[PDB]
Amino acid sequence: HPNLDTFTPEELLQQMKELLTENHQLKEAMKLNNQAMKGRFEELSAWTEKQKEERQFFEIQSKEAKERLMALSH
Amino acid sequence: HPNLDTFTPEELLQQMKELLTENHQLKEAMKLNNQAMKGRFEELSAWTEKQKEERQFFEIQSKEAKERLMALSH
Amino acid sequence: PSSNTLVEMTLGMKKLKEEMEGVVKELAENNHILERFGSLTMD
Amino acid sequence: SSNTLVEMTLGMKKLKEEMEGVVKELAENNHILERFGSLTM
């Protein structure tokens, strides 16, 4: 159906308007995703630092406790 | 002659072929980008889990060492 | 505005619409994974 | 073709500029993802 399945100039224009809108919304959504990904990155960096510091606190407590014990079982 | 800032039919079709090329490129890049998102999510999951497990290991080690210190202090 | 031009523009414009349907689903997936990123350091 | 080739020209041009904008955001996204890989190492 060549007549039906072929767009008029006005329908082509309408389609162009719609693709523009979809592409703009796409662009803006990706900007927001990048902002949020940068946030997730700082969060994960801060978190891993906190974890390392807590791990160290515990290694140190454990070593001190193991030592206080020996320094009396003697 | 056609005006400079207005596409001829031939130029309009050329520009359409360029959009198809660019859009196809975008689609394939997006698929690649989402594969990367998923790969990073998997790596970060594994990584955060490892650090929790390592914190917990030393926390338990410290706790038991202190308990041992107290019970054997008498 | 010739037949050939309109047919070729129509084909192209329909193809662009198709591809963008695929793109926006890709974006939807991106959004989902990003949402899950915010839960990695929780529990 | 009067102002329908005029109108189509502007429509096609805007679409091209907008798709270019999407590519830049995608490029930034890919850069952030590279740094995420760096985080685990």
Author numbering:
A (entry chain A), B (entry chain B): 29 to 102
C (entry chain C): 678 to 720
D (entry chain D): 679 to 719
Text from the published report:
OPTN is an ubiquitin-binding autophagy receptor, which is initially found to participate in the xenophagy and aggrephagy processes, and more recently is also demonstrated to involve in the PARKIN-dependent mitophagy. The N-terminal coiled-coil region of OPTN is responsible for its interaction with TANK-binding kinase 1 (TBK1), which is a noncanonical IκB kinase family member involved in innate immunity and autophagy. Here we biochemically and structurally characterize the interaction between OPTN and TBK1, and demonstrate that the direct association of OPTN N-terminal coiled-coil domain (NTD) with TBK1 CTD domain is responsible for the OPTN/TBK1 complex formation. The structures of OPTN NTD in complex with TBK1 CTD and the related NAP1/TBK1 complex solved in this study not only elucidate the detailed molecular mechanism underlying the OPTN and TBK1 interaction but also uncover a general interaction mode governing TBK1's binding to all of its currently identified binding adaptor proteins.
Fortunately, using this short OPTN fragment in complex with TBK1 CTD, we obtained high-quality crystals that diffracted to 2.05 Å resolution. In the final refined structural model, each asymmetric unit contains one OPTN(26–103)/TBK1 CTD complex molecule, which has a 2:2 stoichiometry and forms a symmetrical hetero-tetramer consisting of a OPTN dimer and two TBK1 CTD molecules. In the complex structure, the two OPTN molecules mainly form two crescent-shaped continuous α-helices with their C-terminal parts (residues 73–102) directly packing with each other to form a homo-dimeric interface and N-terminal parts head-to-head bridging across two TBK1 CTD molecules, each of which also adopts an α-helical configuration. The binding interface between OPTN and TBK1 is within the N-terminal four-helix bundle core, whose interior is formed by 10 layers of interacting amino-acid side chains. In the OPTN(26–103)/TBK1 CTD complex structure, the OPTN E50 residue is exposed to the solvent and plays an adjuvant role for the OPTN/TBK1 interaction by forming a charge–charge interaction with the positively charged TBK1 K694 residue, which is further neutralized by two nearby negatively charged OPTN E46 and TBK1 E698 residues.
